[PDB]
Write an enzyme that holds these catalytic residues in place. Structure first.
Site, PDB file in Angstrom:
ATOM      1  N   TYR A  35     -26.713  35.331  11.211  1.00  0.00           N
ATOM      2  CA  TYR A  35     -26.202  34.340  10.179  1.00  0.00           C
ATOM      3  C   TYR A  35     -27.288  33.344   9.813  1.00  0.00           C
ATOM      4  O   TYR A  35     -27.507  33.131   8.673  1.00  0.00           O
ATOM      5  CB  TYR A  35     -24.985  33.571  10.742  1.00  0.00           C
ATOM      6  N   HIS A  50     -19.193  33.510   4.128  1.00  0.00           N
ATOM      7  CA  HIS A  50     -18.442  32.580   4.973  1.00  0.00           C
ATOM      8  C   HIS A  50     -16.998  32.416   4.524  1.00  0.00           C
ATOM      9  O   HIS A  50     -16.135  32.117   5.335  1.00  0.00           O
ATOM     10  CB  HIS A  50     -19.096  31.202   5.096  1.00  0.00           C
TER      11      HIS A  50
END
Length: 232
Positions: A35, A50
């Site tokens: 991420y 997200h």
């Protein structure tokens, strides 16, 4: 515009000679890495990811080391020489953001260790899947709304619908229906919930199997679960 990208990512520790720890529970560290690489090269994409509800269309395996060596009742193992992990997606913007995020930075911090990006190996995808035996690279999680063992039969219809739900998300529309899994070996491992290491042969539509190969089988793929490979 989907096609599969699959990478092996090798890391070397800061000093080539020494033993680096790997916590047994390192999903969350690995997930920060992945991420953070994507958020770094492409913040718009990482904000899309997200938000998106459903599978994110990517997975990666456990972090593994060349040789190993397991102490007794310690939270980590020891690894030597290289650290590595696979990553797979069917979204070419995610695969690009991940590799550039690792290039835009080559000094990586995992748990308590300092690693440098050594190599990224790109992996050829099998022409077909119907009939092969698969081995999990990260364990498969199935939950129903609790944990669903592979010895129960809901295991399989839950996997099957999720691959159909990924197929609707990422190859156009209405999903193939031929599916079967023959589990050869199942071993559980628990993290916070239980996931399963599987060796398994799989049968049925090739494009639905290719789905599972690219983006993961079962649930929480984007947290590092359900990545498989063709058995060696």
């Amino acid at each position: 515009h989907h096609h599969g990208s699959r990478f092996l990512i090798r890391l070397v520790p800061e000093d080539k000679d020494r033993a680096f720890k790997v916590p047994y529970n390192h999903q969350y560290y690995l997930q920060g890495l992945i991420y953070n690489a994507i958020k770094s090269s492409n913040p718009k994409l990482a904000t899309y990811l997200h938000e998106v509800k459903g599978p994110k269309l990517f997975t990666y395996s456990l972090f593994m080391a060349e040789k190993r060596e397991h102490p007794k009742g310690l939270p980590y193992f020891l690894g030597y020489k290289k650290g590595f992990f696979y990553f797979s997606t069917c979204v070419p913007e995610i695969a690009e953001a991940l590799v550039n995020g690792l290039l835009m930075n080559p000094e990586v911090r995992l748990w308590d260790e300092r690693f440098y990006l050594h190599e990224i190996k790109v992996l050829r995808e099998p022409k077909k899947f119907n009939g092969s035996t698969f081995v999990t690279l990260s364990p498969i999680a199935v939950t129903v709304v609790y944990d669903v063992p592979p010895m129960e039969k809901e295991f399989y219809s839950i996997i099957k619908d999720d691959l159909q739900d990924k197929y609707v998300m990422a190859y156009g529309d209405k999903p193939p229906s031929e599916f079967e899994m023959e589990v050869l070996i199942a071993k559980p491992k628990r993290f916070r919930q239980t996931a399963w290491h599987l060796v398994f042969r799989a049968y049925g539509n090739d494009d639905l199997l290719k789905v599972g190969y690219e983006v993961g089988f079962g649930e929480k793929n984007s947290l590092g679960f359900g990545m498989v490979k063709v058995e060696g």
